[PDB]
Design a protein around this ligand. Structure first.
Ligand SMILES: *[C@H](O)[C@H](C[C@@H]1CCNC1=O)NC(=O)[C@H](CC(C)(C)C)NC(=O)C(C)(C)NC(=O)OCc1ccccc1
Length: 303
């Protein structure tokens, strides 16, 4: 019973994190086997810099890799796109199974904020339809990573870099390429007009039933052709036959069918909610995927 904005067990992530500095400049980094990884802009001190040049005047003693009461020894370095693959003499003892993934705009990851090489708390986030994210990131959180867990793998899939004038962040995949049209320098950058992740407002709605909220369900069915045409006007993102089939597994369990919940949302977008709350939100939350709800509304575990 119940439903929360949970987040994965950030446990395996804490044992890989290392602080990294190169002057009056210190961020966070991620230690895997014998490499440390971090946003290549720790080497700077930001308008139109040129790290390629900056980095050819850098060394291996210029990088003080910090492992708490352990100093790690950059025996080598290089650069992949916008990440700094620092090689250190020692092999990370707390390294689990892992994969560098990239995620389609709409999915979800959890984040471990990290300060001076130290976890500060974990949260769950989602890749917005503009290739940005909404999180708590302060002056100091760079090098913090996003991750997902299928039991005993950690799918490293984001690394904080920068914040956009509206309050939103934007980082790289763990291979040095952002999500979006951004450059890790101090130039004029408008994030972009964002829409709603409709495939996730209806899975959340299903989670609302699973736990006894039915004031939005009805008897109407509807077609896509009209859903997608009513989705667009309230900025929502049209629905695919691809995104319906996933919900199917969750559609069966609830005796409803995916396009029956669709028209219920249409009557929510047109009328509102008029002073109620669906699952503790007087909003609609587009930040829950179907594999998230299956995961809480059954409890698939990880060890
Ligand atoms: C990295 O340690 C640090 C993390 C961020 C602090 C708060 N939110 C974060 O995620 N970010 C930076 O130091 C970052 C470095 C560059 C290379 C991106 C400049 N700087 C920023 O994110 C900052 C907040 C200074 N803004 C920025 O990059 O400029 C964007 C901009 C757009 C238009 C006009 C002026 C500035």
């Amino acid at each position: 019973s119940g439903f929360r904005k949970m987040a994965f067990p950030s446990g395996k992530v804490e044992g890989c994190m290392v602080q990294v500095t190169c002057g009056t400049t210190t961020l966070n980094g991620l230690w895997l086997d014998d490499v440390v990884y971090c946003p290549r802009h720790v080497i700077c001190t930001m308008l139109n810099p040129n790290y390629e040049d900056l980095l050819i005047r850098k060394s291996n003693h210029n990088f003080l890799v910090q492992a708490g009461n352990v100093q790690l020894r950059v025996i080598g370095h290089s650069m992949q796109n916008c990440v700094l693959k620092l090689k250190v003499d020692t092999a990370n003892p707390k390294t689990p199974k892992y994969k560098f993934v990239r995620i389609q705009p709409g999915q979800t990851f959890s984040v471990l904020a990290c300060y001076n090489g130290s976890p500060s708390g974990v949260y769950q986030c989602a890749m917005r339809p503009n290739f940005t994210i909404k999180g708590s990131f302060l002056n100091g959180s760079c090098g913090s990573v996003g991750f997902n867990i299928d039991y005993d793998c950690v799918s490293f899939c984001y690394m904080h870099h920068m914040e956009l004038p509206t309050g939103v962040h934007a980082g790289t995949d763990l291979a040095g390429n952002f999500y979006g049209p951004f450059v890790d320098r101090q130039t004029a950058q408008a994030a972009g007009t964002d829409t709603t992740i409709t495939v996730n407002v209806l899975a959340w709605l299903y989670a609302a039933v699973i736990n006894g909220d039915r004031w939005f369900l009805n008897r109407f069915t509807t077609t896509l052709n009209d859903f997608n045409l009513v989705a667009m006007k309230y900025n929502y993102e049209p629905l695919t036959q691809d995104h319906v089939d996933i919900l199917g597994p969750l559609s069966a369990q609830t005796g409803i069918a995916v396009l029956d919940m669709c028209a219920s949302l249409k009557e929510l977008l047109q009328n509102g909610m008029n002073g109620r709350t669906i699952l503790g939100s007087a909003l609609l939350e587009d930040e829950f995927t179907p594999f998230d709800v299956v995961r809480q509304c059954s409890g698939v575990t990880f060890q």
